[PDB]
Amino acid sequence: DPEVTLLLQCPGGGLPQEQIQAELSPAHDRRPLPGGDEAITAIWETRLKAQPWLFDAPKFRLHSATLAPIGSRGPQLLLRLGLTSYRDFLGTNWSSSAAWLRQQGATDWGDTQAYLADPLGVGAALATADDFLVFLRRSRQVAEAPGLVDVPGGHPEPQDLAGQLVVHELFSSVLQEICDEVNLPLLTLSQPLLLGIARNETSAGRASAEFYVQCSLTSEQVRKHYLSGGPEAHESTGIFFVETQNVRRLPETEMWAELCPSAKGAIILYNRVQGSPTGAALGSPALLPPL
Ligand SMILES: CC(=O)N1CCC(C#N)CC1
């Protein structure tokens, strides 16, 4: 799967909010382009003169994420974050020249991402009470990965002593994205666990934090809530469910070729961090069938 790379695999079956620190610093921002940020401004102008109802929004930028030594006490992860925008994304990662910016970043800064917006996404492996994961079909008329399969998620918009508020907005945003798109009540959802961070190599290396969330409703009740919003309550065109039993071999199915890179990231991290048992009981052959 060349279109997805793992940046972080979390320990302990995944990390809760209270074990993560963030450092939000202008040292973690995109570097100005070599010939100047006028090139981003020019792309934006062209776009607004065709689609004048579009608007900019601030986004978090991922610089890097450092895991503590495994088995340690105290905070287990440091997220190094900067700020970027939807405009900066359109002028860098989305640009036809994005590969030239990556080579220039290697040359000038020893950092393939130095000249890229790299907005941070969130996604969820969302499990039902009857042990299915939740999938969504993308519209064939959208910009990103038209007609492909996705999981619930989005790109959070901003508003350890500013840090803890930032970690809170990241965990809050994955629940809000599930409530807005799947139409589920907030009280049916568990507190999220962070599984890891995946990069989309088809969008010049931008990263998404992938979370595990449990729902107290069955697949049938989740479907009812999604459909009862009507066509205007969701951006997706359909919902469907795969047994957690069968997610283990999803990369061997015809479904895999239809998954967008960020959904492939969520399923790889679910399989490595929540699947793949380590103990004698769950590792026994009748519960973990060989092949
Ligand atoms: C690929 C695409 O269109 N996206 C994903 C990145 C996000 C930002 N910023 C919103 C739009």
From Swiss-Prot:
Residues 147-159 are annotated as: Disordered. It catalyses: UDP-sugar + H2O = UMP + alpha-D-aldose 1-phosphate. Residues 117-273 form the Nudix hydrolase domain. Keywords: Hydrolase, Magnesium, Metal-binding. Substrate binds at residues 55, 86, 138, 143, 150, 155, 157, 262. Changing residue 181 to A: Abolishes enzyme activity with UDP-galactose. InterPro entries: NUDIX_hydrolase_dom, NUDT22/NUDT9-like. The keyword Magnesium applies. Belongs to the Nudix hydrolase family. This is Uridine diphosphate glucose pyrophosphatase NUDT22. It comes from Homo sapiens (Human).
